[PDB]
Design an enzyme around this catalytic site. Structure first.
Site, PDB file in Angstrom:
ATOM      1  N   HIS A   1      -5.701 -43.912  -2.761  1.00  0.00           N
ATOM      2  CA  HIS A   1      -5.355 -44.286  -4.126  1.00  0.00           C
ATOM      3  C   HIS A   1      -6.194 -45.407  -4.715  1.00  0.00           C
ATOM      4  O   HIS A   1      -6.119 -45.685  -5.896  1.00  0.00           O
ATOM      5  CB  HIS A   1      -3.872 -44.656  -4.239  1.00  0.00           C
TER       6      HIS A   1
ATOM      7  N   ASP B   1      -0.882 -46.967 -10.977  1.00  0.00           N
ATOM      8  CA  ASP B   1      -0.829 -45.688 -10.277  1.00  0.00           C
ATOM      9  C   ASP B   1       0.621 -45.204 -10.519  1.00  0.00           C
ATOM     10  O   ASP B   1       1.565 -46.010 -10.392  1.00  0.00           O
ATOM     11  CB  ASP B   1      -1.037 -45.925  -8.764  1.00  0.00           C
TER      12      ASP B   1
ATOM     13  N   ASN C   1      -9.579 -36.453  -3.652  1.00  0.00           N
ATOM     14  CA  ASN C   1     -10.989 -36.843  -3.791  1.00  0.00           C
ATOM     15  C   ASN C   1     -11.916 -35.860  -3.117  1.00  0.00           C
ATOM     16  O   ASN C   1     -12.986 -35.564  -3.628  1.00  0.00           O
ATOM     17  CB  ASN C   1     -11.306 -38.246  -3.256  1.00  0.00           C
TER      18      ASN C   1
ATOM     19  N   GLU D   1     -14.914 -33.762  -5.007  1.00  0.00           N
ATOM     20  CA  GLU D   1     -16.311 -33.770  -4.552  1.00  0.00           C
ATOM     21  C   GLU D   1     -16.792 -32.367  -4.253  1.00  0.00           C
ATOM     22  O   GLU D   1     -17.941 -32.029  -4.549  1.00  0.00           O
ATOM     23  CB  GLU D   1     -16.513 -34.676  -3.320  1.00  0.00           C
TER      24      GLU D   1
ATOM     25  N   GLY E   1       2.121 -33.588   1.958  1.00  0.00           N
ATOM     26  CA  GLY E   1       2.209 -34.000   0.576  1.00  0.00           C
ATOM     27  C   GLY E   1       1.839 -32.845  -0.317  1.00  0.00           C
ATOM     28  O   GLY E   1       2.216 -31.711  -0.055  1.00  0.00           O
TER      29      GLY E   1
ATOM     30  N   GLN F   1      -1.059 -31.522  -0.826  1.00  0.00           N
ATOM     31  CA  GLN F   1      -2.247 -30.779  -0.423  1.00  0.00           C
ATOM     32  C   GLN F   1      -2.068 -29.270  -0.479  1.00  0.00           C
ATOM     33  O   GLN F   1      -3.043 -28.513  -0.673  1.00  0.00           O
ATOM     34  CB  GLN F   1      -2.693 -31.197   1.005  1.00  0.00           C
TER      35      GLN F   1
END
Length: 446
Positions: A17, A114, A347, A351, A366, A368
Site C-alpha cells: 500500500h 488509503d 501492482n 506492471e 484477499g 487477488q
C-alpha cells in the site's frame, strides 16, 4: 495571500500500500510546490518508504503508533499487525494531525487516505475538511463492498461457479472468486475484515475516490455503476513518477541474462512478498519449470530454497535463474519475457498489463481472486492455473499454452492490445490526465 493549503495523508501503513500512495503524493506535491503535504505513517512504514529516499521540500513525514505495545510479539500471519494498527482508532491519527499542524503552522485543509484507514474519515469530519479515499487494490473489487448481503447470500446458497450477474459490468465474476474475508461471520471476522466490510457505507462520504488504475481497462458498466455510488470517481495513472524510483544494482544480471534470450520466450515467476505458497506448491512450481524446458526467472525468497527439489537449481542453471530479488518493472518491460506467473497483487498486475505480458494466475488471498478472474475472463490476457493450485502437470500445460501453443494466440494478441490501450490511457489526452487535474483543484479549492 499566503498559501495555507495543507493536505494530510494517511497510508494503510503496510508493504504494497505504501509506494502507490507515495507516488500519488509526489505527483501532487510537484505540481503544487506551494502546498504542504504531510505524510503520516508508523515507524516501520516510514522506514520502508523514506530510508534511502530524497523527498521534495513540501513533503514532510510524521510518525504515529503502529498499535503494537512494546514487548508484544505478533504471530506469524498477515492480519495481526493490520488489526493492531486499525485498533489505534482516530485518536492515533489525530496525533499525526497535531504533529503536522505544529510543524507547518497550518491547519489541515484536505485529507487523502488509503480507503482501508476508515478512521481517517472521522478525522476529516471532525476537522470539517474533505476526505479523499485512495484505492490501490483491484479496481473491480470496489463493487463488492456495495453488495455484501447479496454476495453473502449467493456464496452460501448457489454453486461455486455461479456468476455474480447482479454486479453491473462484472457478471464474469463468480462465487469462488469472492474474498473469503467478506464472507466470514462470527469468530472468524477480524477488525480488518469488518473495516473492509464497512466500505459500502464509508466510501460515499468521500469528496472523491481516486483509483490507482486505468479507467479505459475497467468494464465501462462497472465505472458507471461506481459513479452512481460515489461523490466523485477519479482515476490517476499508477505508473511511477521519476521521483518515486530509486536506482538498483541488478545484482543478479537479470536484464543482461534476458538480453541473451529470444522474444517472449521466458517465464517470470513471482509470488510477491506476503504470500508464502504451501510448500507442496513450491515443489510443484519447480518440477513444472524444470520439466517445461522453458527459460525462466523465478524471484523466490531465500528461506524457500531448502524446500526446492534436490538438484533442481543446479540442473536448471543453464536455462533458469532462481534469485531472491529482481528489478520487477524492468524484468516485466523486457521483450524476452513471454509470461508472468503471478499471485495477482495489484501492482504486479498493473506492471504486467502495461508491458503486454500475459499471465498465469494463482491468487492466494484477499481480492487477488477478483484480479485473476478479470485477467482470464474479462481482459482475456491470461489464465488461472489449471487446477486453481499449482501442480506439475497443470502448470506445465499453462506454460505451454501461453508461451508456445497456437491455442494461446488469442491471449498473446489480447495482451498486446491491452498494452496499447494503457499507452493511450497514460497519454496527455487521457481522461486520467483530466482526473489528475480535477484532484489538483479539489486540493486547491479546499
Amino acid at each position: 495571500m499566503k498559501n495555507k493549503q495543507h493536505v494530510a495523508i494517511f497510508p494503510f501503513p503496510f508493504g504494497s500500500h505504501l509506494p502507490p500512495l507515495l507516488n500519488l503524493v509526489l505527483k501532487l506535491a510537484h505540481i503544487a510546490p506551494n502546498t504542504s503535504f504531510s505524510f503520516i505513517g508508523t515507524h516501520s512504514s516510514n522506514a520502508f518508504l523514506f530510508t534511502k529516499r530524497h523527498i521534495p521540500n513540501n513533503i514532510r513525514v510524521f510518525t504515529i503508533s503502529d498499535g503494537i505495545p512494546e514487548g508484544h510479539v505478533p504471530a506469524n500471519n498477515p492480519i495481526e499487525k493490520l488489526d493492531l494498527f486499525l485498533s489505534t482508532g482516530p485518536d492515533n491519527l489525530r496525533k499525526g494531525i497535531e504533529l503536522a499542524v505544529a510543524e507547518t503552522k497550518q491547519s489541515v485543509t484536505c485529507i487523502i487516505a488509503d480507503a482501508f484507514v476508515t478512521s481517517s474519515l472521522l478525522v476529516a469530519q471532525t476537522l470539517n475538511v474533505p476526505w479523499i479515499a485512495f484505492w490501490p487494490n483491484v479496481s473491480c473489487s470496489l463493487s463488492l463492498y456495495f453488495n455484501i448481503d447479496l454476495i453473502r447470500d449467493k456464496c452460501s446458497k448457489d454453486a461455486k461457479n455461479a456468476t455474480l450477474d447482479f454486479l453491473p459490468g462484472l457478471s464474469k465474476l463468480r462465487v469462488e472468486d469472492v474474498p473469503q474475508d467478506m464472507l466470514d461471520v462470527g469468530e472468524k471476522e477480524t477488525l480488518f475484515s469488518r473495516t473492509l466490510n464497512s466500505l459500502g457505507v464509508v466510501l460515499p462520504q468521500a469528496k472523491a475516490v481516486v483509483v490507482n488504475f486505468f479507467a479505459e481497462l475497467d468494464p465501462p458498466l462497472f465505472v458507471k455503476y461506481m459513479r452512481s455510488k460515489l461523490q466523485s470517481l477519479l482515476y490517476v495513472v499508477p505508473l511511477p513518477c521519476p521521483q518515486l524510483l530509486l536506482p538498483e544494482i541488478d545484482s543478479n544480471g537479470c536484464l543482461s541474462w534476458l538480453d541473451s534470450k529470444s522474444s517472449r520466450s521466458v517465464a517470470y515467476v513471482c509470488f510477491g512478498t506476503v504470500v508464502s505458497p504451501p510448500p507442496q506448491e513450491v515443489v510443484a512450481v519447480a518440477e513444472a519449470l524444470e520439466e517445461s524446458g522453458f527459460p525462466f526467472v523465478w524471484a523466490l525468497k531465500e528461506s524457500l530454497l531448502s524446500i526446492l527439489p534436490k538438484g533442481f537449481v543446479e540442473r536448471t542453471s543453464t536455462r533458469g535463474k532462481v534469485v531472491s530479488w529482481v528489478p520487477q518493472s524492468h524484468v516485466l518491460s523486457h521483450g524476452s519475457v513471454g509470461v508472468f506467473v503471478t499471485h495477482c497483487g495489484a501492482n504486479s498486475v498493473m506492471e504486467s498489463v502495461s508491458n503486454g505480458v500475459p499471465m498465469i494466475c494463482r491468487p492466494f488471498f484477499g481480492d487477488q481472486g477478483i484480479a485473476a478472474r478479470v485477467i482470464q475472463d474479462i481482459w482475456e490476457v491470461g489464465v488461472i492455473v489449471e487446477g486453481k493450485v499449482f501442480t506439475k502437470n497443470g502448470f506445465v500445460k499453462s506454460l505451454n499454452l501461453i508461451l508456445v501453443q497456437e491455442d494461446g494466440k488469442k491471449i498473446r494478441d489480447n495482451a498486446l492490445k491491452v498494452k496499447q490501450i494503457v499507452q493511450d490511457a497514460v497519454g496527455p489526452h487521457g481522461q486520467a490526465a483530466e482526473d489528475f487535474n480535477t484532484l489538483v483543484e479539489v486540493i486547491s479549492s479546499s
